[PDB]
Amino acid sequence: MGKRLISQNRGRGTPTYRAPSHKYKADLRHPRVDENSSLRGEVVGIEHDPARSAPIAKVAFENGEELFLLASEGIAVGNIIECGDDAEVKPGNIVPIGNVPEGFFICNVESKPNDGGKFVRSSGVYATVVTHEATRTAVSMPSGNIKWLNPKCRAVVGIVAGSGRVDRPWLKAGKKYHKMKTRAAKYPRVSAVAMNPRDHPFGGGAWKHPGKPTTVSRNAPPGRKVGLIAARRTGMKR
Amino acid sequence: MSKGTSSMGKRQKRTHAKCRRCGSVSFNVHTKQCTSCGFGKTSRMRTYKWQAKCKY
RNA sequence: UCCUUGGUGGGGGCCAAAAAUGACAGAAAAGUUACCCCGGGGAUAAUUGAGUCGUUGCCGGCAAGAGUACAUAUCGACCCGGCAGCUUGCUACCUCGAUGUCGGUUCUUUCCAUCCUGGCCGUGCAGCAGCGGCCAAGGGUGAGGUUGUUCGCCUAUUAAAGGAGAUCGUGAGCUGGGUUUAGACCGUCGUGAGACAGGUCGGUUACUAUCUACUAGAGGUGCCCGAGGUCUGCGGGUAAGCUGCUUUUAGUACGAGAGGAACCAAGCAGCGGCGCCACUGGUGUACCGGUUGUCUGACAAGGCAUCGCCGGGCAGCUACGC
RNA sequence: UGGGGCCCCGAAAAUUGACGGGGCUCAAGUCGACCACCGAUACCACGGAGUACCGCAAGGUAAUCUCGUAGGAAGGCGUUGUGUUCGGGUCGAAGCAGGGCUGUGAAGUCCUGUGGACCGUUCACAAACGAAAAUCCUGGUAAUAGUAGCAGCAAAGCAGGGUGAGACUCCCUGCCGCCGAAGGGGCCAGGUUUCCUCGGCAAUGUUCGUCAGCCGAGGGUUAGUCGGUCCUAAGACGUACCGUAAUUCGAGUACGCCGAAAGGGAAACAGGUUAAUAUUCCUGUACCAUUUAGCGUUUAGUCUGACGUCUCAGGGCAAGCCGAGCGGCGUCGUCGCGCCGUCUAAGCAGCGAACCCCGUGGAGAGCCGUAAUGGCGAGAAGCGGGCGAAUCUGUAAUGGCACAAGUCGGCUUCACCCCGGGACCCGUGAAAAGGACAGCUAAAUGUCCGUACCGAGAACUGACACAGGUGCCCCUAGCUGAAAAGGCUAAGGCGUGUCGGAGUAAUUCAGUUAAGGGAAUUCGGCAAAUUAGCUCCGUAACUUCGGGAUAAGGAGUGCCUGCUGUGUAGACAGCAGGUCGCAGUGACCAGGGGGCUCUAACUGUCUAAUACCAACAUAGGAGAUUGCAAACCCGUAAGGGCUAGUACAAUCUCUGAAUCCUGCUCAGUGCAGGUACCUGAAACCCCGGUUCAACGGGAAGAAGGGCCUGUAAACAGCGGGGGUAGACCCUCUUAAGGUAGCGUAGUACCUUGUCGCUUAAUUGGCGACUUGCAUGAAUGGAUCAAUGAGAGCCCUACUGUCCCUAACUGGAGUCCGGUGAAGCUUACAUUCUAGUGCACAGUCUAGAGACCUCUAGGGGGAAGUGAAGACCCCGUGGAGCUUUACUGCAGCCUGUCGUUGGGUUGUGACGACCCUAACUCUGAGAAGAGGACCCCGAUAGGUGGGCAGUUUG
RNA sequence: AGCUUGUAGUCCGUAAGGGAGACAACCCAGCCCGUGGUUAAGGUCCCCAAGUGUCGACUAAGUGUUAAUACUAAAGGGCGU
RNA sequence: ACAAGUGCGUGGAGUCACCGGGGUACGACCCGAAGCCGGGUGAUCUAGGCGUGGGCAGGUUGAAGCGUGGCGAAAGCUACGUGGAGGACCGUAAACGGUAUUGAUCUGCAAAUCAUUCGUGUGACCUGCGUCUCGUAGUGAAAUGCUAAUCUAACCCGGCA
RNA sequence: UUAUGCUAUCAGGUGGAUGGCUCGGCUCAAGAGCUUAUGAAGGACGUGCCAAGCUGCGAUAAGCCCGGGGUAGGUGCAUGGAGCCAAUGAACCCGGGAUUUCCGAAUGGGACCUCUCCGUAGUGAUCAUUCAUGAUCGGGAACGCUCCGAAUUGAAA
Numbered sequence A: 001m002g003k004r005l006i007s008q009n010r011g012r013g014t015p016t017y018r019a020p021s022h023k024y025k026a027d028l029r030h031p032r033v034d035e036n037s038s039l040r041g042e043v044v045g046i047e048h049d050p051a052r053s054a055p056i057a058k059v060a061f062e063n064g065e066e067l068f069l070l071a072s073e074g075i076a077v078g079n080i081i082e083c084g085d086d087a088e089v090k091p092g093n094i095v096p097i098g099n100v101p102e103g104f105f106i107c108n109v110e111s112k113p114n115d116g117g118k119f120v121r122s123s124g125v126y127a128t129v130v131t132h133e134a135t136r137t138a139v140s141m142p143s144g145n146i147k148w149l150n151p152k153c154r155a156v157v158g159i160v161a162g163s164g165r166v167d168r169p170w171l172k173a174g175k176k177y178h179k180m181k182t183r184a185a186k187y188p189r190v191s192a193v194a195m196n197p198r199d200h201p202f203g204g205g206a207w208k209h210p211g212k213p214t215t216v217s218r219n220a221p222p223g224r225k226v227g228l229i230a231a232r233r234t235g236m237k238r
Numbered sequence B: 001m002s003k004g005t006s007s008m009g010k011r012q013k014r015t016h017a018k019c020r021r022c023g024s025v026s027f028n029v030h031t032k033q034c035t036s037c038g039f040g041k042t043s044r045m046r047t048y049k050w051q052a053k054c055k056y
Numbered sequence C: 001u002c003c004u005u006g007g008u009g010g011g012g013g014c015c016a017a018a019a020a021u022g023a024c025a026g027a028a029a030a031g032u033u034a035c036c037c038c039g040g041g042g043a044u045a046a047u048u049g050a051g052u053c054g055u056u057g058c059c060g061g062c063a064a065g066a067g068u069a070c071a072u073a074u075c076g077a078c079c080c081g082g083c084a085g086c087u088u089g090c091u092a093c094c095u096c097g098a099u100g101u102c103g104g105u106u107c108u109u110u111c112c113a114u115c116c117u118g119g120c121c122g123u124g125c126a127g128c129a130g131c132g133g134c135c136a137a138g139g140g141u142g143a144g145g146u147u148g149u150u151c152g153c154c155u156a157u158u159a160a161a162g163g164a165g166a167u168c169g170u171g172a173g174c175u176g177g178g179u180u181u182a183g184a185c186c187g188u189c190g191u192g193a194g195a196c197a198g199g200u201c202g203g204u205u206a207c208u209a210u211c212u213a214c215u216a217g218a219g220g221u222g223c224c225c226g227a228g229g230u231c232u233g234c235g236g237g238u239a240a241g242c243u244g245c246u247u248u249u250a251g252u253a254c255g256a257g258a259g260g261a262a263c264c265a266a267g268c269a270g271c272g273g274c275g276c277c278a279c280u281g282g283u284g285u286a287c288c289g290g291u292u293g294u295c296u297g298a299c300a301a302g303g304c305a306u307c308g309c310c311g312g313g314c315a316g317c318u319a320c321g322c
Numbered sequence D: 001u002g003g004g005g006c007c008c009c010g011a012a013a014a015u016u017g018a019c020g021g022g023g024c025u026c027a028a029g030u031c032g033a034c035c036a037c038c039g040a041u042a043c044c045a046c047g048g049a050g051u052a053c054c055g056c057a058a059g060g061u062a063a064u065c066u067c068g069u070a071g072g073a074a075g076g077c078g079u080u081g082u083g084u085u086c087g088g089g090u091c092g093a094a095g096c097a098g099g100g101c102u103g104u105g106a107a108g109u110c111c112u113g114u115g116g117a118c119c120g121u122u123c124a125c126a127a128a129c130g131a132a133a134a135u136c137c138u139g140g141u142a143a144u145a146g147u148a149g150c151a152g153c154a155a156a157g158c159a160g161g162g163u164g165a166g167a168c169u170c171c172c173u174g175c176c177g178c179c180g181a182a183g184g185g186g187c188c189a190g191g192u193u194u195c196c197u198c199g200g201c202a203a204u205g206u207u208c209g210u211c212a213g214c215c216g217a218g219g220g221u222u223a224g225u226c227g228g229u230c231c232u233a234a235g236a237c238g239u240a241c242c243g244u245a246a247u248u249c250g251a252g253u254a255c256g257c258c259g260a261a262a263g264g265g266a267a268a269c270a271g272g273u274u275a276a277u278a279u280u281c282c283u284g285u286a287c288c289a290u291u292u293a294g295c296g297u298u299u300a301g302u303c304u305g306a307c308g309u310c311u312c313a314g315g316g317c318a319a320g321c322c323g324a325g326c327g328g329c330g331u332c333g334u335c336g337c338g339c340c341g342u343c344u345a346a347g348c349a350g351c352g353a354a355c356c357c358c359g360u361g362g363a364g365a366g367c368c369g370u371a372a373u374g375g376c377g378a379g380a381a382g383c384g385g386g387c388g389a390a391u392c393u394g395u396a397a398u399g400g401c402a403c404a405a406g407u408c409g410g411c412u413u414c415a416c417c418c419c420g421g422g423a424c425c426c427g428u429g430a431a432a433a434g435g436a437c438a439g440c441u442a443a444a445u446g447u448c449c450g451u452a453c454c455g456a457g458a459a460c461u462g463a464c465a466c467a468g469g470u471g472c473c474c475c476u477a478g479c480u481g482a483a484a485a486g487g488c489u490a491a492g493g494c495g496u497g498u499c500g501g502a503g504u505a506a507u508u509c510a511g512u513u514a515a516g517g518g519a520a521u522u523c524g525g526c527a528a529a530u531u532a533g534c535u536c537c538g539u540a541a542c543u544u545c546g547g548g549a550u551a552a553g554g555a556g557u558g559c560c561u562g563c564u565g566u567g568u569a570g571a572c573a574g575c576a577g578g579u580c581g582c583a584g585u586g587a588c589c590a591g592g593g594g595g596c597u598c599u600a601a602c603u604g605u606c607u608a609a610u611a612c613c614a615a616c617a618u619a620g621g622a623g624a625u626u627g628c629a630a631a632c633c634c635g636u637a638a639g640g641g642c643u644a645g646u647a648c649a650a651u652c653u654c655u656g657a658a659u660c661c662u663g664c665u666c667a668g669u670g671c672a673g674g675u676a677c678c679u680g681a682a683a684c685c686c687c688g689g690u691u692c693a694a695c696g697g698g699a700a701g702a703a704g705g706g707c708c709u710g711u712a713a714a715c716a717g718c719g720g721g722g723g724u725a726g727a728c729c730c731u732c733u734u735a736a737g738g739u740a741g742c743g744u745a746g747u748a749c750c751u752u753g754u755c756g757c758u759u760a761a762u763u764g765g766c767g768a769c770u771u772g773c774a775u776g777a778a779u780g781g782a783u784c785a786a787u788g789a790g791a792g793c794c795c796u797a798c799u800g801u802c803c804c805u806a807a808c809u810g811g812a813g814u815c816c817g818g819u820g821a822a823g824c825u826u827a828c829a830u831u832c833u834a835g836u837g838c839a840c841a842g843u844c845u846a847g848a849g850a851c852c853u854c855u856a857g858g859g860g861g862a863a864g865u866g867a868a869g870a871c872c873c874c875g876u877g878g879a880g881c882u883u884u885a886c887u888g889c890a891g892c893c894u895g896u897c898g899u900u901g902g903g904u905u906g907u908g909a910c911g912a913c914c915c916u917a918a919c920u921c922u923g924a925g926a927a928g929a930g931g932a933c934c935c936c937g938a939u940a941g942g943u944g945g946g947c948a949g950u951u952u953g
Numbered sequence E: 001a002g003c004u005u006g007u008a009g010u011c012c013g014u015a016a017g018g019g020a021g022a023c024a025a026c027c028c029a030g031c032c033c034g035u036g037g038u039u040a041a042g043g044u045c046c047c048c049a050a051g052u053g054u055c056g057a058c059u060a061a062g063u064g065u066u067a068a069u070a071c072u073a074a075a076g077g078g079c080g081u
Numbered sequence F: 001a002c003a004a005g006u007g008c009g010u011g012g013a014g015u016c017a018c019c020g021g022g023g024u025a026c027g028a029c030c031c032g033a034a035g036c037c038g039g040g041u042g043a044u045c046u047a048g049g050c051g052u053g054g055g056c057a058g059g060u061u062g063a064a065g066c067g068u069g070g071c072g073a074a075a076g077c078u079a080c081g082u083g084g085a086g087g088a089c090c091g092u093a094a095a096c097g098g099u100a101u102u103g104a105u106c107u108g109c110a111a112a113u114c115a116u117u118c119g120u121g122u123g124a125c126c127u128g129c130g131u132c133u134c135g136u137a138g139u140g141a142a143a144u145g146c147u148a149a150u151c152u153a154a155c156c157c158g159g160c161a
Numbered sequence G: 001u002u003a004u005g006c007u008a009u010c011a012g013g014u015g016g017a018u019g020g021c022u023c024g025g026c027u028c029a030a031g032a033g034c035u036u037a038u039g040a041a042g043g044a045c046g047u048g049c050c051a052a053g054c055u056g057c058g059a060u061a062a063g064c065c066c067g068g069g070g071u072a073g074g075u076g077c078a079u080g081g082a083g084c085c086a087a088u089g090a091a092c093c094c095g096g097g098a099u100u101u102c103c104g105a106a107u108g109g110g111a112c113c114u115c116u117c118c119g120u121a122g123u124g125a126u127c128a129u130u131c132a133u134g135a136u137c138g139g140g141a142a143c144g145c146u147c148c149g150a151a152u153u154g155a156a157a
C-alpha cells in the first residue's frame, strides 16, 4: 500500500492539518431573527479576525445580545445596524435580496432563508443583484456564476471590508509562514515529483517528471485524483 | 548529535506509571490505560489467547 | 441411467469425431531494484594464480629484391619455424563461512631481449658524428605542465634520462584521485518503476603482532687445566665507489676546406658511501636582556599568559658546514 | 653424391637450485647384446583366523574364497528399566586414576589406591539407549600475558608534624597550583537515603589507602504565609444518546470532570539554634483567609486577573566604585600604603513622577513640546484641583558584630522594578478561578501532601565513579577590554576531569623554531603559514540602485609632562612637548586579498551513525476542481477533516526570485464536452418452450465504449537523401518537422575536436567556432547583482607542502613498583630454495642452512585476524515499487427493485408536470427551504495499480 | 588448452603393498595374520640392498644421467665426429 | 454389441496378530533465514501540529518618517542632523548545527566522542514542560529520512516445530 | 646441578563431571466442580523483641473467639539469645464466627497522585416493580454456546 496522499492525511483529521480553532474570534453569521421580526444594533468596535485576516465588527443589538458580525467596507463605530425586511437598503444593513435594487453590491449572502450567510465573505469580495422574479432572484457571484437564490435570502449591503489584501506580494517565506501559523493549511508543501513512488502517483524516476498525464479523470478513486482534476482544458490562454 | 548514547540522556521522564489495579509499571500516562491488565479501559482483565501458545 | 413408483421437460453416461495447449509427455501469466534482503555456489562470472598462445613483444630459415654495380654495410617481400608470457583473448582447474580490488608514494630485490657507462666487429667507417651487430647486469636511468591514470604527449636539463618481473611486488606501510554502494543533476533509452561498458558533484580505510623472517642489544651452555691479553682466519658483506665539465695533448692526427679526435696528466663538479663539529648555519623551553596584561600594597624581587611575546646565545646535537 | 648414429649452432626471464643430490668422461651418458645379484603383503611352503557351500555329526572341499565408498543383508558389545532365575555388599557397593589378563573388536573381568551404600547375572522384553565434529548448546579454564589500559580534552604536587601494625595517596600547618560568566551559588525532572555521626577495609575505587557517594550500625526532613492544593489553556477522561455481529471499539452532541511544582495566584520577614532541619523549630515584630457574634450598607455593573515582537525616554534600586573619620589584619631592605568592616528586614504611617480627568484660560504674517513621532478654536500655552508608582523618609530599636568601631558624603547602576511614548503585522499576540468598589471590633480554626541530600567531568540518563546528553535552566565580584570574549586575581569549590617513580634509545599524539628557495609537494595549497582591534584617508568591475564594501591600497597607535572642548554628570573627543625599545591592538584577542567561470536567486531544510550538495523548500509565475447539502478527503456506520472557513477562499498539480521570453504538433495516451448513428448487462414487456419453470429469441436501452469536437504552462513529440556558385523546384512528410536562444556544455561518442589568452611545457581554466553520437523554451530557455563551509582555474601574500631534514617542548613508548583484561588458536613448528600436490607449501620430495633463551624495533610471510561475500550466478526463496502483465477488491458512474404518496395531461406500464403528507436540511422552537428527488439496502454493467495476491519458464 | 563434447577397454572414485624424488588414476600387484624362501616391476659408484659387471662401438657437448606423461623446444644448417 | 477377434475372470485360501523393512499425510532425523498474516505496544528518542514559559554577550550597518538649511519661476532636486527597519552584517566553548583535518580514537571517554577549523546566532530562530498524530499507519522544507541503538513497512506475542 | 624446555606418571591447587540419594516435575486414571456489591480474585502498603526475602495475617495485623479431634509440649520456610504461651488443655487439623487499611467489578467526585476532595454520611451505570425491594457488572485451568475471521503452507509455481 503506497503511502496515503496529503489529502487523505488531511481528511483523516490529524493535528498537522487541523485548524487552530481556539485562535479565532467568533463564528460569523447573521443574527437569528424570527419571521416578520427585526432588531437594531450599534457598532461598539472594529476588531481583527485571525480566521479571515479581515476586520469584524462587534455589534450590540437592542436585546443585549453582543454578536460579532462580518464587517462590510465603510462600517464604523457608533453606526446603527438594522435587520429585517423593513430595514432600509443601506450599507452594513441585513435585508433580503428581494428588496435590494438590481445593480447593488451585497455580501455574506445566505444560500437559504435564515441561513446565516455562506457566500461572498472573503476580504473585499462582493456580489451583484442581477434580476428579480417572483420565486427567484439572480446574484452575480465573485466567481462569475449567476447563482439563483430565494427572494428571502438575507445579505449585508456593501462589499466586504479588507479589500486589497492580496495586492501585496508575500515577498518572503516567513511572511507566508506567519499567515499559515493561524491557518489550517500545511506549510511548506513538497512537490509531488520530488516524492518517492510510494508517496505519490507522480513520484519516483531517475529524473523529475510525472510519467503519466496530469489530467486525472473525475471517476478516479481517492488517493489517485491528483494533478489536474477533471480539467476541461489546460495551459495558458493561447 | 547521535541516536545512541548521545540522545539517551534525555530519559529524565516517564510514559508508564505504576498501575493501581495490578501494581505493575504499565499504566500509560497519556492514554490512561494499563497495558498489562487494561485498567482504565475495561472492567475485566485483558487476557488474550496469543499470550500463550495453542494447546495442541 | 436420474435418488418409492409411472409419465413429461431437462440432466448424467458408454463408443466414436471436432475444437489446443509450438515451452509441442500439455500453468489461464510483464517488468524493476545501485534501497534491496535471505539460502547456497569456485557446481558458475569481475578477481589474482595455473593451462594455451589466435593476438601482442622479440626472433630465426630461405633470401625476392632496393642499395649507381653488388641479396646479406644498411632495409628485408612472399612462404615457413620459433621463443617470452611482460597486451588482449580462450578456458573454467583453485579461491564466493571474502587471498581488500586501479594509479601514485616508500623500500628492497630480480631478468637481459642493454638506453647510458666498459670491450670489440662491419660499414656505402677520412675526422667529428652516425648506422648495424656481438660480449657485458658493476653502477646510472632524474626534475617538471595536463590527466585519477597505466600508457602517451609536452618542457628544459642530462652520459642516458631502457623495458619487464616480484599475487598487473608493496593498503596488519601510506594516499583515496578513478572505478564498484546508498543522494542529486545533464543527455539518451523505457508508458512506468528504473537503466546506461555516458558525463558531472558528494561520499567511514578496523586490529594491543601468537609463530616465522629480518634488524640491532644481552643471558647461558657447547669448545675448554682456571683466568687474562694479543692474534689468526673457516667464512659472511661491499659500488665504496660510479659518471660528467673544463685545461693540456691540440686547433695537432684526419680533411680540399669547414670541421676536428684519442693515449698519458691535472683540476673541479653530480650522485653515492663513511666520518666529524675548527669555521658557517639551524635549534638551543640552560641562561641573559627588553616589554604587554594582571596578581602578590609601591620600589625591588617574583607567579601566570605557548618559553606570554620579542632580541641574543655558550655547550650539546645536526646540515645548509667540513 | 645419397642414406644413417651421436653431438653442436639455432637456444633470451625474471628470489639462489635442481640428472632427486653428490658427482660421473674407453662412463656412473647413448646404442646392440649378455651375465650374476638385489628387490614386494605377488608366487611357493609351513602354522593360524574368518568366510562360502555340503555333511545328521565328526568333518569335507576352495588354483577356480578373503581389498573396498553410496548401499543391502547377517551376527554381536554397551547404557537404563520391567518380568523371571541365580546372586554380590560396612570382613566394604557404585563411581574415580593407573595397571595385568581375555577377546579380531565392541567390551568384559581382575589387581593397586580412594570411597562410604547400594550393585549385578540366566532366559526374554522395552527405550527420553552409545558422540569427535553441527561458526553445535551450558559450565569450567587456558595461550595471548603479568601484556594493552591505568597518558592526549583541566601535565600538581612538595616540607614539617600527626594518626596507623602498615601512608605518594587520610588529617593539620605552610609553600606551589586548577576553575573563577564555570569546575562557584539556586533549583526542575530524575535518583531514593547517596544526607549526618561512629566503626571497618573481604569485594567496589583504573594503584594503595588508616580514606570514601563502599561495607555495618544509629540518627536526620516539623509550614495558615514556600510549593502542591484552587483556576482554566492545548488536550484528555467519564455517563447518556447513536453506531457496530459485538465490545474493553468509534466521530459528534448534552451534562460533567481532569489537565501547568516555570501560565493565573490571599498572606512573613530579620536574627538564633543542630551533627544533619529551617521563610517551617525558638525570640521579636507582623500579615492573610473562613466561620460565629455585635454594629450598617450594596455602586452590581464595570474594572483587575489579562497578555505579542522591536525600539526608546524618565524615576528608583541590588551589585559595583571613590573621598574623610573610626577598628582590626598584612607589609615594613626604603615607603606609607593594601585588604576587611564601619550593618538594620517585613509590617505600620506619610509624601508622590508620568499618564488620565475636571475648573478656568484664550494661541496664528503661528505657537507649546519630546530622545523621536507630535499637540492645538472639534480649544494650545499658563494657573489651580483630583486620581496616582517604584523607591525614600520615620518607626519596627533590639538583633547580631570579639558589648571593635558601628558615624558620614559622592559617583554609577545593569541584564532588576515602576512608568510612558513610538513603530510593525495578509502574524492581532489565551481563558477561567481569584481580587476592588461596605466594611470595623472580638474569639476560635487554618486539615492533607512535599520539605533530608546530589542536581552533575562521581549522587540523573547512556551496562560504569562513562570526555556524551539532560542544565548553561537561572544568577555570578576586581583589572584589561566594546564585552558575560580571552588573560590574570577575589569569594566559593578543589589538588579526585583517582596510578606513581625514572630521566636512557628508536618510534608515536600534540606543539615551538628553522638558513637559501617559495607550491618545485599534491588528484587538488589538504594541512600549516599570512593578515587581524580601533581612528582617519581612500575604495574598482558589475548591479535588481538596495549593494559590492571591512572591497582593494595606505597612515597613526606605547609611556610621561601640561592642557582644551561637549556633557548636569559618568565619561567621551582632541591638542602641544618630552622620551624608551628590534617591536606600542607589544601578551591575550583578532578577516589574508583579488580576478574569471559553472550551478542554485537569496535566509532556510536534509540522509541522527560515511553524502550540508547543484538536491528539498521558498517568494514569484501558471493551470485545474468547486457556489457550500460544493470540490477534495476520512469512516463499516454513527458521523467527521478542510471549517469558528466561502472564489481576494480551500483543495490538487507543474515551474522555481528579478530581467528578456516561452515557438510548431490534438496523429498516440490522458482529460472535458456533444452525444445523430452503432454496440451495450439485469429488471420489466412480447413470442416460442415448459400440464408450471429452467431455456431459446424479440422489443427497448442507462452508464461505459465506438464515433465527432476542444484541450500541450496535460503526458509528450518537433526527421533523413540529391544537387546548384550554399541563399532553391521536391523530399523523408502514418500530427509536426526545433522558433528565440544556448552549444565540445554538469549534455559531445569521435575527443586530449580546431584557433586565441594563461604556462618553458597545461587530457586543465577562460574566450571563440560549432556538422548538436544524444540542446532548447514553465519535461521551462538564456542570463543574472547579492548570497554560498558548493565545483573548477588564475594572480598576489604566506609558509617545513617540498628541495631535506634538523633541534627543542609536553604526553606516550623504553626501564622500574602496584593493578590488570581481550581478540586469532586441530596439532607440531628454528627456517630458505626448487619441484610436486585442486595448477599460490614452515610440515610432502630433493637439497641448503640451523646451539638455545631473552629484550627492543617496524610490519616482509603465516594466501595474518575481524565476517556463512554486500560483485556475478543459482533458488519453480522473498520484499518494495511500476505498468496498455494475469486474476481480482475498494472508491466512483449509471439502469432496475424497495424506501415511495396524491392529481394532470402525451402514449401502450413509460416520460414530464403540479401538490404536501412521508423523507431531508436549517433553527431552541414558531417556522423556512427542498420533496417523493436525494441519501440508504440489494442487484446489473462500466471505469478502476487507489489497493491485494501472483506470474514473468 | 591440465579446453569442451563422444566411443572401446581398464583404472581412480572405493585400491593397500613394492617402484618411479615427491605422483588419485604410470609399471609390478589386486590385500586375512605370523614366519621362511624366491621372484615381479625397477635398480646394482655413494646417498641406498645388490656390479667402479662383461663384450663391441658412439658422445667431448656436463650433451646426457627424464619409459607413459598436462612434467620433455622447432624450422634450417654443420669440410664436429 | 451385429460380426469375429481379444481384455479381465473361472478347477475353494484367506483373515487376524507379534517382531521387522518401506511408502503417504501430519512438526516427521536435528538445527538453519528473509519473509506472510492476526491481536496488542510505542511519539521518554526522533518528525510534525498546538498550549504555556525562558533565552539570544558586545558591536556594526543605518530603510521609511521627522527637523533645519541650500538649489530653482515652478515642477521638483539636494546636504546634514534625528530616526531605529531588516527571514541585514561581525561574533563567543550562550544556544543550535556539524564543513575540513579524510587529525585523535577505532577490543575507544563514546555501539559516532574529542581537538582545531567551521555555518546560523531578532527569527521559516533555539529550547523547557504539557498535549496530540502510528504500522500498509503517522510524520517528513522529501533522504525511502524518522517513528525508543530496529525501517523499501517498526516492536511484542501468537499462526510456527 | 643443562637454564628455557619436551613426554609419561605421581602429590597438591582451581573445578564441579561421573556415581549415589532426593520433600520436586511430567503423564495417565478416578472423583468433585463455580465464586463475586453481605465488596471477591489480583495488587499496594503495613504486620515479628532482635525479622531482610518468602509465606500468613490486616491497625484485634505469622493473629482473636467458640464446638469436635489430639495431648505435652509449642513459639512458620529457618531446633540462634532472652522471654512468652500451655494441665483454666495450648501448638496443630476439621467445622462455625469475629477483625478484615487503600486500590481493584470499585460503585459519592477525582486520578502520571494506590492516595486525595466534599462531607449534607454516599443505591456509580443499565434495568424490573406494589416504587417496599431486587437483578446485571469482576474472576475461574480448560471445556460449552453464539457471532466475526487470516496467512504461512500443500498443489513440488
Ligand SMILES: [Mg+2]
Pocket: A002, A197, A200, A201
Ligand atoms: Mg502508485
Ligand SMILES: [Mg+2]
Pocket: B053, B054, B055, B056
Ligand atoms: Mg487453543
Ligand SMILES: [Mg+2]
Pocket: none
Ligand atoms: Mg532512491
Ligand SMILES: [Mg+2]
Pocket: none
Ligand atoms: Mg602488506
Ligand SMILES: [Mg+2]
Pocket: D071
Ligand atoms: Mg557401506
Ligand SMILES: [Mg+2]
Pocket: none
Ligand atoms: Mg564433546
Ligand SMILES: [Mg+2]
Pocket: none
Ligand atoms: Mg608514567
Ligand SMILES: [Mg+2]
Pocket: none
Ligand atoms: Mg585562572
Ligand SMILES: [Mg+2]
Pocket: none
Ligand atoms: Mg584497591
Ligand SMILES: [Mg+2]
Pocket: none
Ligand atoms: Mg487542575
Ligand SMILES: [Mg+2]
Pocket: D600
Ligand atoms: Mg541554495
Ligand SMILES: [Mg+2]
Pocket: none
Ligand atoms: Mg528546487
Ligand SMILES: [Mg+2]
Pocket: none
Ligand atoms: Mg510550450
Ligand SMILES: [Mg+2]
Pocket: none
Ligand atoms: Mg594544476
Ligand SMILES: [Mg+2]
Pocket: C040, D868
Ligand atoms: Mg555463502
Ligand SMILES: [Mg+2]
Pocket: D876
Ligand atoms: Mg527449477
